[PDB]
Amino acid sequence: SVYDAAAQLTADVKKDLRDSWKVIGSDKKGNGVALATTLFADNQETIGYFKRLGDVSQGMANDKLRGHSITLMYALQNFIDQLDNPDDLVCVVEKFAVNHITRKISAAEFGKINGPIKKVLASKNFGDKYANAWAKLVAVVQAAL
Amino acid sequence: SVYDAAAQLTADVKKDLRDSWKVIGSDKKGNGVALATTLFADNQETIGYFKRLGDVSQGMANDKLRGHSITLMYALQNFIDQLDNPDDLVCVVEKFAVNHITRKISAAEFGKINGPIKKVLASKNFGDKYANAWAKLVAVVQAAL
């Protein structure tokens, strides 16, 4: 279950998530847009899902993309803040899962975000250990999809 | 105009928003649920819009309501963090406006949140001065609906 996946996040994993977030989460606009644009660059097949945002190749200049990207980072902020209470983490994860289930995003497709996250982490010198920690957090959402 | 509304957020208004947020934003789960339940209690005619959350009278015990309420507080956190840059505040406000436009929520009904905000603030010893500051922020969202 989702609760199971959440309750598995160990102290070490939570430590790595918080340490890396202190950095990548410090510039939500810059890193949020980097995350989104990297997703579109490496997984062009996902562009169609974001038609509401207009021309995503416009990057930072696209106000709809910027608003979306900043907000995406607050969903992650939400997750990080709920790490010590699986019950709260689960209810917020399920909330965001619904947002994606309604758009027909499968657990497998949702996992496509791991590549971009790994790249954004690497830009700040956070290696594989950190990418693995984030993949575990993403897997909690996948358990709800 | 959302831009003219954003212009109403003067130095004094921004300070009052930040000062009060430091307190109410410290307990997102507790105050978020308080805000939502107050809205439902004082404006029963709005409960229909929240059909997805189930029995909202259950309050904190309702997992969907708790997830929704915590997330609502992160939307406010988002707004507060964008006060320095008008262009960024506008794009995030327009993003959330869409979430409500699709739910058929008008500017007038969105404004029904002012009562609950005033009550929650008052319980924390923040009077009319602060309630009015928050009404100006809510007015920016109203301009986009």
Ligand code: HEM
């Ligand atoms: C770290 C992972 C992710 C997080 C935290 C996340 C978060 C969000 C948030 C907060 C929204 C706005 C929800 C709303 O207001 O309706 C959203 C929308 C959306 N997401 Fe994600 N998302 C993630 C990954 C993905 C991936 C990998 C895909 C696609 C393969 C995806 C597809 C969508 C789509 C299509 C929308 C709707 C955009 C729109 O029309 O406004 N998301 N996401």
Ligand code: HEM
């Ligand atoms: C401070 C004011 C408010 C803020 C910041 C706010 C924020 C939010 C957020 C973040 C969501 C989730 C969007 C999504 O994922 O689709 C939401 C959903 C919603 N909001 Fe608000 N909201 C506010 C006031 C109101 C008011 C006053 C009403 C109604 C009179 C309203 C009606 C709704 C409805 C119907 C939903 C959909 C709930 C669901 O089915 O999940 N909101 N709001």
